[PDB]
């Protein structure tokens, strides 16, 4: 839980001033004002949509979700209103496969990649009982969303250091890319789909493109293979005084 990249080599996460404004009885929040407001809305538009580059006649259909956001200052309700939009399903649901839609919900709303096939198949268990709105509100009303983001900050890609699986850090680095990278470049076709269902890992050059500036992006590759052989049984011996002991 130290995480040597997070507030050192990246920026600080954006969001509202505090969460004590909800208990204030003459206001609802520290009132930001329309220069301090819309530059936070620029960071929700760059995160829920990727870099989708939404036009002026596509933002006009999102007029109602901002007008509620500048009165009720909850960030989580703004993210929930933008994921049930037409502009979220015409980019990430309409021409994609099912695990491509699921792997972008982990990117846009959690900042991580899915850790399992069992965690991934339970999101298709919620598709059968309520469609795509049952997937979206179960991510938003989860415990993992509450104890990382809450109502206060935008859901950002967080370098944690103490990931519950090491593979979770790998699939986060494939999902986000560089800053000149959107998420329409594959023709559908989930990137993490082979590695979730089989149990293997990712490619080292695809992860090191998305690492920050100043973190040895790519070195360490020996010129032999990049993954491990599960069938190999090596002999690793320890020197004692007399000989060499192969505690296998």
């Amino acid at each position: 839980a130290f995480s040597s990249i997070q507030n050192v080599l990246t920026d600080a996460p954006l969001g509202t001033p505090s969460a004590m404004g909800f208990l204030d009885e003459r206001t609802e929040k520290p009132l930001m004002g329309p220069s301090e407001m819309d530059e936070l809305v620029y960071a929700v538009y760059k995160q829920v949509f990727g870099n989708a580059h939404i036009m002026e006649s596509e933002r006009a259909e999102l007029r109602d979700a901002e007008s509620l956001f500048r009165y009720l200052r909850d960030v989580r309700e703004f993210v929930r209103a933008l994921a049930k939009s037409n502009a979220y399903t015409s980019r990430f649901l309409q021409g994609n496969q099912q695990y491509r839609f699921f792997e972008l919900n982990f990117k846009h709303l959690l900042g991580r990649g899915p850790r399992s096939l069992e965690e991934m198949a339970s999101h298709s268990a919620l598709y059968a009982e309520g469609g795509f709105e049952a997937v979206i509100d179960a991510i938003l009303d989860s415990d993992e969303y509450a104890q990382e983001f809450g109502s206060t900050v935008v859901p950002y890609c967080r370098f944690k250091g103490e990931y519950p699986t090491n593979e979770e850090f790998n699939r986060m680095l494939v999902l986000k890319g560089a800053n000149s990278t959107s998420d329409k470049a594959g023709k559908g076709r989930s990137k993490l789909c082979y590695s979730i269902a089989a149990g293997c890992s990712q490619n080292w050059l695809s992860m090191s493109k998305a690492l920050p500036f100043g973190t040895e992006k790519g070195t360490g590759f020996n010129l032999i293979s990049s993954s491990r052989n599960p069938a190999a049984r090596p002999r690793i011996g320890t020197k004692i005084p007399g000989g060499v002991v192969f505690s296998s």
């Binding site: 969460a19 909800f22 909850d74 809450g150």
Partner: peptide
């Protein structure tokens, strides 16, 4: 920046339950 003693939609509830 999350400040653990905090909620999101029971905060919606009790302002429309103390009036009730």
């Amino acid at each position: 920046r999350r400040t653990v003693s905090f909620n999101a939609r029971v905060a919606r509830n009790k302002s429309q339950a103390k009036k009730i």
